[PDB]
Amino acid sequence: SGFYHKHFLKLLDFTPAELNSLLQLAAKLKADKKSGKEEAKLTGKNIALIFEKDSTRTRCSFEVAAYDQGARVTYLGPSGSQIGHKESIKDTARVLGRMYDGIQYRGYGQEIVETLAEYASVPVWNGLTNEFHPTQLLADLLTMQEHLPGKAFNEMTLVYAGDARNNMGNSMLEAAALTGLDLRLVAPQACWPEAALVTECRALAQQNGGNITLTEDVAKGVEGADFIYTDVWVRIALLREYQVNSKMMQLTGNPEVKFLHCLPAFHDDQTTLGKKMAEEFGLHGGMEVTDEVFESAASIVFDQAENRMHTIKAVMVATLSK
Amino acid sequence: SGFYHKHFLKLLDFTPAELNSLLQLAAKLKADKKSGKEEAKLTGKNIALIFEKDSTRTRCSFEVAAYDQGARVTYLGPSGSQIGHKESIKDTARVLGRMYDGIQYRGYGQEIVETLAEYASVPVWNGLTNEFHPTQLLADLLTMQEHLPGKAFNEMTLVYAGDARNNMGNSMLEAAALTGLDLRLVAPQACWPEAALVTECRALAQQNGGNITLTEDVAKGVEGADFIYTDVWVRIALLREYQVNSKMMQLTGNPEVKFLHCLPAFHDDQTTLGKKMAEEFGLHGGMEVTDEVFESAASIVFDQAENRMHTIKAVMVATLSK
Amino acid sequence: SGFYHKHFLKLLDFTPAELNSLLQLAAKLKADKKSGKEEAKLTGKNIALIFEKDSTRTRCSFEVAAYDQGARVTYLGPSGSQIGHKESIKDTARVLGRMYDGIQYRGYGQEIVETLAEYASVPVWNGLTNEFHPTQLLADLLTMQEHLPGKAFNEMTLVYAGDARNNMGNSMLEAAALTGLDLRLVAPQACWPEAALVTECRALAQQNGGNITLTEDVAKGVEGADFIYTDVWVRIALLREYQVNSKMMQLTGNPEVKFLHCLPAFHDDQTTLGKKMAEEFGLHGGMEVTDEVFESAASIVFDQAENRMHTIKAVMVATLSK
């Protein structure tokens, strides 16, 4: 149903045909920028980017995306008391929608996005809440298409290893449901998404040709991994054995498995904090991904990072333009 | 007189005919954006927005206004030592006028705006100083026109209730003087606007068909209000009895009284801070405005908020273009 | 020879013929914007401005310069943990180059600029590191041409007085080397630039028609100066006797001597920090420059400040377009 003036607050508010449409729009606009004949469809729009908590990355994707299409951005960073402290979400939203054509929100609970959406009558895009992270997985699913041209998501295996009882885990679940992905969350039990969402999402997943299989077992859960996905742990205790290293890549029995990570990643034995941990916890060569896999032929990590922009642009063009 | 390249530092530097002209320009441009045929008249201008002290709102009004007209904005937020600490106002201004086409300043005393104006060679707009707040009252007088179409400001009665020995009180006075409004500051005496300005402003007010009446009685001052206006108190002690609640609205004897507030406002028993005020000093239903009046069919608060943008745009178009 | 897609990390990575070409491009673009027929050559570019440490001035020069040419800017200010703390320079750069067409970096060591340059596949401009400050001296050498039309830099005498064991001193050295300037660093011995760079850049300086002289003698260093240049001291102890005052200007025996200062400057007995210093340390009339020289007909300080913009624009046009 028309993306026009819709919000983008979580993936499951969309059908798989809507998702597929966003993903194809993201791909036309990628090809168009790269080819030099991008049709700027937001040439008068003013977007507001509220970031209650930082993110170098989402800001940059939302600013470059907007700008390529002709829109101007007002970045509102973590500096004012945050929404709910001195002024009502209901009043912040209501004022903002009088001036801006669309609002990105990144912050705290999904309640804040859902209430900003309710009262600012402009589309509200969800840059990450504690509960969900939809724009990320748009970049991801698009990176997956590109590295398996023609295979449908229906016949792709995704392993997300590590802590999943969080908005990354929740988001993998909503992804599988709208996609039909053979999605394996490979994590200690304590690190697995909530019962209800997994119940809901499996049913949808299966119904679309995939299924959500929850394992602690590395080689088994990885068995025929197409992609292996992880993100930062901090924990190092239960999570240690889940490190994506070339052994894990080998245990797929797959000469063409690929690696993804929503960055930042701790793979060096260099960076201030990463190194601290390499020392303390013995994790040398890297923490959740080994540097030799991160800098492997197999990581498509920086195409994944580039795709963050092409999909946020798709969300904004889809909902503000016709 | 034509505003081209004039500074906008306080309302009394303008004649009522100049004020009326700003206000009409604000309303052409409002209608033009709403109708989709805004003529961007600032398409090469670079504006600098110095905010020595925050304001979510003024930044957004200045950014959306500038951008609609084609200008690019450089926001300079409270982060660098403020103007006067490590570098001369005389030097800050002189460098800035070499690069930018106009400077908005929001901060501390009127001395800083008046000095930036003196040395920057570009128009300097006053986003709020301790002494004055002119752009606000532009939004306000425009909101008043719209909600009493045809009635001239001479025949509208404005009540500004609450604390008034401040830039809001000073600004109401300058507004009455250039307008001819029957303006009633319904404030405790400890809170009245500095005597001479009232002496000056009332003689100009009268001269234009209104008169400024300073009182402490709610009933007396509210008598036949057209609009009732307030803003945040903190104090709760002398100000308590001045809360705009439906009894105040009723004491106008006027069923079409409409309410105004330069936001933010403490009307909830939600807003963390406000909630403490509700417990701590007992202002339940809100502090300076009751939530039932703030969310009344009588409040024009968010049109007032939207009008902040249409009038900042008028100031900028008037002074950077012909 | 072409600057196209080249980085800009220090002056000595360029030949005197490349430098001369930047400086002439800077002057065409100055004249063009002043004569209203600037050809915006960056109309689709997205530039990222990383400022690990503040600067009111560099941000403004980079923002106005980029915007006049049609580019959109994403200012990344000191707010995220800085590059190296939670994420690899190698990863920050690699993600940024996927989105932005050029990166300005201002911060810490030259190692950070040189690594960002290495891994971001776009040009990286050096806004100031501890070791070098090239864009500044572009503005400076352009301000010098303009105030001695026709004299070649070979036939100019520059005095840089005060502390030089720093990126301003290092930068004067690289300037002399590529220019042939009779450059005199009139500094205490404690404050002389490091020896190896002086060995290198004197030899290049001479080879181009100038020579680098370092002295503690104000009178012998100043002797026939064309321009006298200084910057902030804090130190007040060894540096005191180096204050540029009208006696120094007189000791050039040169009536046409002109004064330069990369701002901010402590010349008032007004600004809070300058007043502490004025009373505590008895430097009335200013600290490193006297106010009577700063506000002299000899100070070309604000043309120098304006020129900051025309040269950053030259750097960006030179390296992003053809």
Swiss-Prot record, chains A, B, C:
It comes from Escherichia coli (strain K12). Keywords: Allosteric enzyme, Amino-acid biosynthesis, Arginine biosynthesis, Cytoplasm, Metal-binding, Transferase, Zinc. Gene3D superfamilies: Aspartate/ornithine carbamoyltransferase. In E.coli strain K12, trimer of identical or non-identical chains are composed of ArgI (I) and/or ArgF (F). The trimer has the following composition: FFI, FFF, FII, III. E.coli strains B and W, which are known to contain only ArgI, produce only a trimer of identical chains (III). Reversely inhibited by N-(N-Sulfodiaminophosphinyl)-L-ornithine. Zinc is an allosteric regulator of the substrate-bound enzyme and a competitive inhibitor of the free enzyme. Its main location: cytoplasm. Belongs to the aspartate/ornithine carbamoyltransferase superfamily. OTCase family. L-ornithine binds at residues 167, 231. This is Ornithine carbamoyltransferase subunit I. Reversibly catalyzes the transfer of the carbamoyl group from carbamoyl phosphate (CP) to the N(epsilon) atom of ornithine (ORN) to produce L-citrulline, which is a substrate for argininosuccinate synthetase, the enzyme involved in the final step in arginine biosynthesis. Zn(2+) binds at residue 262. It catalyses: carbamoyl phosphate + L-ornithine = L-citrulline + phosphate + H(+). Carbamoyl phosphate binds at residues 55-58, 82, 106, 133-136, 262-263, 308. It comes from the Bacteria. It is found in: Cytoplasm.
